[PDB]
Design a protein around this ligand. Structure first.
Ligand SMILES: O=C([O-])/C(F)=C\c1ccc(O)cc1
Ligand SMILES: O=C([O-])/C(F)=C\c1ccc(O)cc1
Lengths: 76, 76
């Protein structure tokens, strides 16, 4: 599986990115019956002013199918 | 944060989807210091014949930047 994480900017060093990836990996292995070798993970830091584009392209159109819906709304 | 999970087709029921979302949520809360309300999660099933397009758009061009690189390769 390929996991993409989008978030607002924060200071995250390589040890912190690796620890995040490890914990995501364990969850994916246990829930999707995956193998470590099949898992890839991207982390993309998006400035808050550009979050509306993520809402419009990714979040809102998929509201009917999201496995976890946001606790906020940004329809413009 | 917005998390997108792309994987091959699988039978997943409502309880399974919600448990996967909750384990992902807690990992994001731990590593990104996020609030529950800011987290959204998508699960997109991709047919195996369409995985090369995911590799070409999301994995290969971002290879060095990935926080977890794939153990497999589509360019051997
Ligand atoms: O959590 C994040 O870093 C983010 F990308 C977006 C977000 C969305 C809604 C909020 O209330 C807070 C942050
Ligand atoms: O894990 C998945 O469900 C997937 F979308 C692709 C994949 C990639 C490499 C593998 O070895 C197995 C599956």
């Amino acid at each position: 599986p390929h996991i993409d994480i989008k978030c607002f900017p924060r200071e995250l060093d390589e040890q912190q990115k690796a620890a995040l990836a490890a914990d995501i990996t364990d969850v994916i292995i246990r829930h999707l019956n995956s193998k470590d070798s099949s898992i890839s993970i991207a982390l993309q830091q998006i400035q808050p002013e550009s979050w509306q584009a993520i809402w419009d392209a990714e979040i809102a159109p998929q509201m009917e199918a999201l496995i976890k819906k946001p606790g906020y709304s940004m329809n413009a």
